[PDB]
Fold Uridylate-specific endoribonuclease.
Amino acid sequence: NMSLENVAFNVVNKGHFDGQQGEVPVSIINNTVYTKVDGVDVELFENKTTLPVNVAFELWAKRNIKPVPEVKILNNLGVDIAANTVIWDYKRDAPAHISTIGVCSMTDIAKKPTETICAPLTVFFDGRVDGQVDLFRNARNGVLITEGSVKGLQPSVGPKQASLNGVTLIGEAVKTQFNYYKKVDGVVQQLPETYFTQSRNLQEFKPRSQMEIDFLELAMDEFIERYKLEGYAFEHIVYGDFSHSQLGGLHLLIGLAKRFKESPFELEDFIPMDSTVKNYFITDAQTGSSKCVCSVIDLLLDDFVEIIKSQDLSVVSKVVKVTIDYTEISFMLWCKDGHVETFYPKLQ
Amino acid sequence: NMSLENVAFNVVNKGHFDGQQGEVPVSIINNTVYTKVDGVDVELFENKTTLPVNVAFELWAKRNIKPVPEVKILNNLGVDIAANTVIWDYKRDAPAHISTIGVCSMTDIAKKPTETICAPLTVFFDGRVDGQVDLFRNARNGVLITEGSVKGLQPSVGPKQASLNGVTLIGEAVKTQFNYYKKVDGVVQQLPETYFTQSRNLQEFKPRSQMEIDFLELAMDEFIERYKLEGYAFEHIVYGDFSHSQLGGLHLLIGLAKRFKESPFELEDFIPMDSTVKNYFITDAQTGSSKCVCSVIDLLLDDFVEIIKSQDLSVVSKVVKVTIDYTEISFMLWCKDGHVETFYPKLQ
Amino acid sequence: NMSLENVAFNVVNKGHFDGQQGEVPVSIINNTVYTKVDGVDVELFENKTTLPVNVAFELWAKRNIKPVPEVKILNNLGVDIAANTVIWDYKRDAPAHISTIGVCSMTDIAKKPTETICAPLTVFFDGRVDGQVDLFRNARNGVLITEGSVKGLQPSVGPKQASLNGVTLIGEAVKTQFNYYKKVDGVVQQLPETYFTQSRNLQEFKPRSQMEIDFLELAMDEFIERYKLEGYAFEHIVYGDFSHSQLGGLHLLIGLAKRFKESPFELEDFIPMDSTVKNYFITDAQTGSSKCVCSVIDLLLDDFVEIIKSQDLSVVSKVVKVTIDYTEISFMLWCKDGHVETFYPKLQ
Amino acid sequence: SLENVAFNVVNKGHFDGQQGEVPVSIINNTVYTKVDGVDVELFENKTTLPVNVAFELWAKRNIKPVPEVKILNNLGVDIAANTVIWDYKRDAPAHISTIGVCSMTDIAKKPTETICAPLTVFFDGRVDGQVDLFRNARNGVLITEGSVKGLQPSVGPKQASLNGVTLIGEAVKTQFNYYKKVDGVVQQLPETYFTQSRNLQEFKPRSQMEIDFLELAMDEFIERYKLEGYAFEHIVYGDFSHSQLGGLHLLIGLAKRFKESPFELEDFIPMDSTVKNYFITDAQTGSSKCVCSVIDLLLDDFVEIIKSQDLSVVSKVVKVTIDYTEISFMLWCKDGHVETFYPKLQ
Amino acid sequence: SLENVAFNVVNKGHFDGQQGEVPVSIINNTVYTKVDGVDVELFENKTTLPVNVAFELWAKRNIKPVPEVKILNNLGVDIAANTVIWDYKRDAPAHISTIGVCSMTDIAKKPTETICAPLTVFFDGRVDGQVDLFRNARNGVLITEGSVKGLQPSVGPKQASLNGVTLIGEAVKTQFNYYKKVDGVVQQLPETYFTQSRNLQEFKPRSQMEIDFLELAMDEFIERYKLEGYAFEHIVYGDFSHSQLGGLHLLIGLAKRFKESPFELEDFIPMDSTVKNYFITDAQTGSSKCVCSVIDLLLDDFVEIIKSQDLSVVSKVVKVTIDYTEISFMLWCKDGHVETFYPKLQ
């Protein structure tokens, strides 16, 4: 249904689909959509997805252009589909969900989230859309986000940052912190206490606490002495060991950011997707130290200190469970003689 | 005609087509041209155009490697085809024109611009090529560029910058400023007074006037006080307003360049092509302010001041026509109580 | 043989092929390999080679993840194939060799380098692999690298740098300097005296000698006066001449690096491959000077001075042979009145 | 694995669960394998699925007599239980998802999982345990060779599809009993006709009436079977005298014309359906028609259908249950005689 | 050049060494050229090679009667000397590399180069100088129309492939002498049978026995040629009475059944080979079989083969030299009579 030429018209004139009338000439060659501008063809969209080119073009045009939760948050909450919108996964350059509800005729399994097939699925609801809060109250399974209080529902304060057109940010002119609600089989769930990843990047890293400021500005020996971190293997775990062929430690993003400022290195994101834990194939250019799988997580340094200082160090090795981004993340804790040897996360 | 293997030989040995004899083995897989170098295949060209891979490879090899006018200039003058050359559009990674004249057997509609089919078309002529000035005198419709005076023809001084192998620059070892001539139906046209875009880029921005130097170095309140810009909404139009979810103003490239130095942001070039006005989907990373369609133009700040100060501000809204790059650009001027509210261009 | 799904399992869980048991769902669309992660497909590998997508995916997964000689070194030594490993050419994003030995059922011409078909081929042997040194002693034609002495074989000290996962580096936590051995028709060859290219890059250039430090920090006139280089055309050859439309000289990478720090320019690598000499289509953005084929080599400045000062300057033009990276590189030497006019390499 | 699937295809003609591996190359939408140094094509992907996925599904297709896709479609079948029904009309799987067949297309390992409740799962009573799975399924369709205790059966058509070959089994059984459940409730399947599923070239009659139609002429056939006033020639034999081709809606009529004068049929919707639409062009006269609905009913059944109609109305929609689905016919009458009577596109 | 190759195809039907150029467009895996402003398809790449490469090889294919690919395969031929043998069964070159043919696929310009020593190069004695190149080759295969001085010949089959057409030449010579060298030593080619290379539809008998098989009935044919106890009907004619199709392993038997009742054959390994395997489904009865090995031997030769067997063993593997390769047959016997006797997949 709808129109391919009408979708391209909206993209050309409005930057995205805005429900406007009009058509433009369109050519589809390989996995690329073109339109003719004064006799010559101009590329509008390159299909990087597993869907037909014309279908993925329509879903990307109809993506949500407002601050939406990051895909890793939606995945950890078990979101299967969105209600009358499309969450675009910029990490994968693809839709975050397979099917849609009242968006595209090819991908629509339904037009309204109240249809029968939507009941077993966990539908994502947006409180900023009028009526979707009540649609969440009638839905069997679903997740809801709001900017304020919901009557008769205890909220869960989500992370400070959100994704706007692929840009993860803490909004100042727009609000990016949401209240989270979840229902399973009609039962409003009580979401657990959780840490949140900071979703920062290695090059444009910015500290968000005084402890992180001291980590980047001060030397390691004096930073450990100031915050009293003797015996926790912070040198190994955070800053990493580059003295051997096998790179030791380096599992906190703030550690990678500090090293990258001083010495560049290569990171192969062999599982390119949005996930709470990221695995990388790292190769240090200065020393040559490397490691095939290096689990990295972007926790606030103050939060990581709280986690490492709240563990029992009497066992040589065990699995530690930490609730991060509403999901249970497994950490491997290695100790000897009462002090920490290493402490790294694992990917699912 | 000609030879695919001979074209690849010239590219390998001369960096482009130089009319040399010789052949090399060639493989064509998908939209990519390969050649064998000591037993293994090396990629020579990736077809990003709407033409067959072997044809686009030949046209790119036969591109003009001398300073040529930017495609937006040729488009605004209504150029349909070039005479015995290929203008490569690096913005689109494709030929600037559909057909050719005496270049490629597949794309040739003629071998000489004096053929019958060339008369209704606007053929681009290069005065630096011997004989093409006189070919322009006999052509019905055409555009001519020269480095010096043409006998019996009043010239139009074009922009200072030109495109050399995709690099827009003001030449110092080579000349990039041309004289422009246009004929329509055998009648030598008189080209109008026009401003010229500066064709600069956001990251490598360089000021070309003392006013632009003061804009980047001084604060906004003192820059407006120095050049006496009270009531023209220069804060809104040039520097932009990031206090709300909808990004306000920011339509001059020099404004984007100043902000990018201080705070990064995202620009989605959803119509990737060379045009006098560029539309972008912008998202500010620091504040979260955004706008789907933000028309941006790269005018010299002194020229923009002359335009904004030469308008009647008695009407709340009207369309203002400004001749830029030999084309009529429509601006929307918003005023209230005798002062400027906003003033932004529109794209065609 | 083996399993596509098992190869993808190793990549997901181990970052590369590690010989582990397990399978994951795999989709192959166009030239791209995908796997399903919680209902959605994630791209694992984009085939940029001339081989079938599933085959190239297996070879890239089974690439050698240890410091290996650069492909240009292996090519100059005439290496045709590797013994029970895959050397990945990151310059071409493709295998360095067409066939394999005991790696992939589709590309295997043999399982052991002692098979009959391996005798005429020059097989690369790794002394760090147990038993491959003796396999080199029994092989007819082959090349061997070791970290230490080989009994009854005089070694050739190779370059200081090696390629680790595509990163060329001088290892500090790992050893990157090897001893080289070559046999032709069962006869252990005596490798000649050779210079070695530094394999540095233009942006992250780092000086490796006091002379190179003085070149970057001091002005040209005083650098030539300090090291007494009058009459060798070092200004032309190294720093380049940008005063004319044809760019003069600039054939040493250290010269390009110094200019790029001060003024950016464009380099078109029209033969993207690993070779001792690299040809580029250069365009200077500041001046507009350009050249279609500009041979560039990355020699230590001290070594280049030794070469230019060890030539006879009585002839206007001649071909000079220099042994670099174990291969004979042809240089063109131009002189007049006893002084050097220019001196540039040529590509094969 | 991909190499194991290709092994079974080479050695067993299909996936047979045997262990083994062969080298595989995937280029374009085609699967190749090396036989003495050269590549041999094993499968050309004509589906909308990835090449390796569709290859695995085609290898795991059901090689036993299965109901024709038009039957499963008319019954609302959405998925199959631990098997793949291959749509040879489309060179593609008859269903999007699978149950315990392929890791890429599986929505579940077993049909009793909660994700399979709102879907109408197809069950094969010839496989052990599938009858009981049909009893525990919320929505489903079941075929059996014999009776199921307590269930009121519905006798299916005589023919079935075997490796894309529609046939009435003689060394095998092709007629099944049909059962359907909706929202956990067994539904009474309606009394229906069945299409004969014959083809143009190899058309063969299946009744003395169909033998008389082919051997005799219309004027004698209309008199012997008393078909005056029903426009049987226009509807079945067709009219080629004008620019627009008139009538011709029974496949037996197309077969009679084809042996005499050839014509072209463009199956512009290439799929298995009870009513097929074609763009027909007669090579001898030039008469044509863009949309010509054709159905392969036994001529005796069509005679029974047309004669039970009320010929006192100029036009009315006649709903006939064929292949378990309601087929709408357009009936035009005038002065007590039939003008035309044709089916409509489903 | 690419444009020169396309010139020869248009003007000469193949590459003929003529000079000239025509404009060429390469899209998908297809080669096009402009004829009066519009593109005409010249070649659709069905191979695993790049489109421009496979096009050049197909244009330079050998247009003379050449041995069938199954013959060259059974002799271990790896490459051809200054020619291209086109495998029409696969729509692809019969060999991966070339010698002095195409710059992209050439491993050498001349077969006497050192890289060609371990490979079995195919030599054509009809080309000047190739016989002497065979003498100097370490591994090779040679065909000639006459005798070569000093070499013990091996008479090849009567038929050959001409532009993909297998025929017994009448205006041309299709029977050659064969020679083989291994490690520089001439090898004695074994005494062998030859397949007839006939097809299903255009099947024609080549002996009075094959004429009697088609005209007469089995009971009379078995008596006239004294084939009692050899299960000749089960093996040749086949059994359609059960779910699994029984026997049917001689192509002449398939031809007899096909003219009576049609059946479907899925060539799931589409290549030229002495023994072909098919997934067969009979349209009338429904009897089928996933892997049915078929071979096109002269019926007189098969009678000679089956009668020389020892019928006192329940099961044993019988190796028969056919098309210069050892074909393994499965022989099942009981109580002195043959149960079945079928070839196996190569």
In short: The longest strand of chain A covers residues 327-336.
